[PDB]
Every structure is written in structure tokens, then in C-alpha cells.
């Protein structure tokens, strides 16, 4: 039902997907069921979201009830940076694929470029709260991930929260077998990513926009923070088209050929978020929205800003 962005592999990635970060156990299964019924085919998942098993339950049931075929679903997951060491890449992936109850993933992403210390903690810190870096790097991780593609377990690899310098480092890696098909990064009218998007597309790499609604449910939201959903200029453009702000925020990416993955566990909103192929933002409206860029990140991960491959010190 969503249109598709063509990947460098010629696979078709549905341009709208369901986000699952912060979707609680006990709600996410129904959210995915509702989404599939509404015509979503792309679901965005991650090991670190700690809810992939419920996502897997929903997909499995919808497939068995013949609501959807596996071939028409596009499931993305991510390798968390505590798992960059070779045996850990496979073990992390295997837990993800098992939880999701799939025989293959459509895309597996490096979740963040900066490595974290391996062990039991997802967010390893020292006695000052600073992230502890790891031994293996994302280049090491990538090599282990390429094996998954060779074995038919993953159709395509991608990256997330990478700057152009880091994509360069990957594309230049000696013996590189597979190129990233997407870079999943924060993107919305307050962080328009013009240079990064330009760079990615010029390398034949798609962009997946995360937190497109401004992630209002992120734990660290402060009342004074920018709030896209409440932005009167966005709402004004919405009103013109008799749509909601969320729908304009989602449509914005579609018109830049950028994949977008709004999260909701509210059934009415899940449905609302995909009613975005029946209107069109004018050229003037796109330019106005583009002009709202504030270089504001809802997802900064400042706790890890000291690590070698922290991505957000670069200009883009």
C-alpha cells in the first residue's frame, strides 16, 4: 500500500514503516497486527528495544491467518554496539531472528557506529556515567554481518546514525563485500539533513528518517524542547489539506524519497499515519517546511560523545 524506494539491490523498501522503539510489551503485538491490517508492510525493530518477540508473534499470526505473505513484508532490525565482536554479531543476530520468528531479515543495520564494551550491560558505563568503548569496531562488525548475507539470512545490510565520514570509511574498507542500502538517521523539519541526504543519495544509499514526529515520548523530553506536532506553521499546512500535523510530517519525507518510520501503539494513529498517499504538499509547502531546520536532535546520545566514532561531531 505504501509506495517503495528502490534499494541498490533492486529490492523494494516500503516508504512508510512502523517504528517499535518504546512500544511496550503487551501493546506492541497488537500495534503490529493493526498496522499489518492497515497495509503497513515495513516494520522497524531492534534488539535493544527488547520487544522483538512480541513483534514476531504478530507477524507469525498474521501470516498464518493469510492476512499477509512473508515476501510482502519488509522487516528491519539492528545490531547493538555491545555486540561488534565476531561471535557476538552472530549470537545477537540469531537472538533477533529467533525472537522475530523469521527465517531471514530484509535489512540488518549497524545501530550506532561507536562500539560499546561487550558484556551483560546494554549501556556500559564507568563510575562517572561515561560510556565505555569496546574492542571491536563497526568495520569488524560489518565483516561478520556480510557473512549473514552470503548465507541468505539477511537480504541487505545498512547503517544507522552514520555521518558521511563513517559511510566513507565503510565504502573504502578493503575487501568490502556488501554496501549499505540505507542510513537510518533522525530526520524531520527541525533537522532536515540536507547535506547527509545529498551525500547518501549520491552514493546510491537510501535514507530512513527516524523520530519523524519529534519523538514526543522520548524519556528526556523537556517542556521547552521544540515540538513538531504542536508547531502552528505545520498545523496550518495540515489544515489546508484537511490532514493532521503527523500526516504532513510523514508526507514530508515521502516527497524527498526518504523512507519514514513513525511509531505508534495507538490503533487510530497507526491507521492515521499511513493515510499519506492521498495528498501532496505543494512545492511552496515543501520549501516552507524545509526552511524550519533548526539543527535540533531529539536523539543525541551525548553520553557517548567521547568515543572515537561518535557520529554527531561531524558537520554531516
Ligand X SMILES: NC(=O)c1ccc[n+]([C@@H]2O[C@H](COP(=O)([O-])OP(=O)(O)OC[C@H]3O[C@@H](n4cnc5c(N)ncnc54)[C@H](OP(=O)(O)O)[C@@H]3O)[C@@H](O)[C@H]2O)c1
Ligand Y SMILES: O=C1NC(=O)[C@@]2(CCOc3ccc(F)cc32)N1
Write out the catalytic residue numbers. Answer: 49
Half-sphere exposure of 73 (CA within 13 A, CB side): 28
Alpha carbons 156 and 109: distance in angstroms, whole number: 9
Pattern of binders to ligand X over 143-162, x per CB under 6 A?
Answer: -----------------xx-
Alpha carbons 53 and 160: distance in angstroms, whole number: 22
Say whether 244 sits in a helix, a strand or coil: coil
311 near ligand X, rule: CB under 6 A: no
Quote the cell numbers at residue 162: 552514520
Min separation Cβ 175 and ligand X, Å: 26
Pattern of binders to ligand X over 282-301, x per CB under 6 A?
Answer: -----------------x--
- Number of residues lying near ligand X (CB under 6 A): 30
Min separation Cβ 1 and ligand Y, Å: 24
Q: Are 6 and 63 in contact (CB under 8 A)?
A: no
Residues 96-135 binding ligand Y (CB under 6 A) are: 111
| Distant-in-sequence, close-in-space partners of 254: CB < 8 Å, separation ≥ 6 | 3, 15, 16, 260, 276, 277
297 near ligand Y, rule: CB under 6 A: no
Residues 38-97 binding ligand X (CB under 6 A) are: 44
Quote the cell numbers at residue 5: 524506494
Residue with C-alpha cell 500535523?
A: 245
Say whether 163 sits in a helix, a strand or coil: coil
48 near ligand Y, rule: CB under 6 A: yes
299 near ligand Y, rule: CB under 6 A: yes
Choose from ligand Y, ligand X, none: what does 301 bind? Cβ within 5-8 Å by kind. ligand Y
Q: Are 173 and 139 in contact (CB under 8 A)?
A: yes
CB nearer ligand Y, residue 246 or residue 261: 261
Quote the cell numbers at residue 49: 528495544
Query: What's the chain's length in residues?
Result: 316
Residues 18-37 binding ligand Y (CB under 6 A) are: 21
Pattern of binders to ligand X over 26-45, x per CB under 6 A?
Answer: ------------------x-
Closest CA to 80 of 44, 108, 103, 39: 108
310 near ligand Y, rule: CB under 6 A: no
- The number of beta carbons lying within 10 Å of the beta carbon of residue 313 is 9
Min separation Cβ 214 and ligand X, Å: 5
Choose from ligand X, ligand Y, none: what does 48 bind? Cβ within 5-8 Å by kind. ligand Y
Residue numbers belonging to the annotated binding site for NADP(+): 20-22, 44, 160-161, 184, 210-217, 261-273
Min separation Cβ 288 and ligand Y, Å: 28
The residues that touch ligand Y, with contacts defined as CB under 6 A, are 21, 48-49, 111, 299, 301
Amino acid at each position: 500500500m505504501a509506495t517503495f524506494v528502490e534499494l541498490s539491490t533492486k529490492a523494494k523498501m516500503p516508504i512508510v514503516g512502523l517504528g517499535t522503539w518504546k512500544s511496550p510489551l503487551g501493546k506492541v503485538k497488537e500495534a503490529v497486527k493493526v498496522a499489518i491490517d492497515a497495509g503497513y508492510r515495513h516494520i522497524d525493530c531492534a534488539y535493544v528495544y527488547q520487544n522483538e518477540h512480541e513483534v514476531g508473534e504478530a507477524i507469525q499470526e498474521k501470516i498464518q491467518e493469510k492476512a499477509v505473505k512473508r515476501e510482502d513484508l519488509f522487516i528491519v532490525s539492528k545490531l547493538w554496539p555491545t555486540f561488534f565482536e565476531r561471535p557476538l554479531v552472530r549470537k545477537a543476530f540469531e537472538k533477533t531472528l529467533k525472537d522475530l520468528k523469521l527465517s531471514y531479515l530484509d535489512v540488518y543495520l549497524i545501530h550506532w557506529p561507536q562500539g560499546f564494551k561487550s558484556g551483560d550491560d546494554l549501556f556500559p558505563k564507568d563510575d562517572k556515567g561515561n560510556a565505555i568503548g569496546g574492542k571491536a569496531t563497526f568495520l569488524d562488525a560489518w565483516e561478520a554481518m556480510e557473512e549473514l548475507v552470503d548465507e541468505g539470512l539477511v537480504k541487505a545490510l545498512g547503517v544507522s546514525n552514520f555521518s558521511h565520514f563513517q559511510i566513507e570509511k565503510l565504502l573504502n574498507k578493503p575487501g568490502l563485500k556488501y554496501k549499505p542500502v540505507t542510513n537510518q538517521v533522525e530526520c524531520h523539519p527541525y533537522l532536515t539533513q540536507e547535506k547527509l541526504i545529498q551525500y547518501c543519495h549520491s552514493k546510491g544509499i537510501t535514507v530512513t528518517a527516524y523520530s519523524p514526529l519529534g519523538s514526543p515520548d522520548r524519556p528526556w523530553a523537556k517542556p521547552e524542547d521544540p515540538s513538531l506536532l504542536e508547531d502552528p506553521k505545520i498545523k496550518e499546512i495540515a489544515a489546508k489539506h484537511k490532514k493532521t500535523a503527523a500526516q504532513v510530517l510523514i508526507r514530508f519525507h515521502i516527497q524527498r524519497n526518504v523512507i519514514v518510520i513513525p511509531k505508534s501503539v495507538t490503533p487510530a494513529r497507526i491507521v492515521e499515519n499511513i493515510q499519506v498517499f492521498d495528498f501532496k504538499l505543494s512545492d511552496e509547502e515543501m520549501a516552507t517546511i524545509l526552511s524550519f531546520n533548526r539543527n535540533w536532535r531529539a536523539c543525541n546520545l551525548l553520553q557517548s560523545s567521547h568515543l572515537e566514532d561518535y557520529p554527531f561531531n561531524a558537520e554531516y
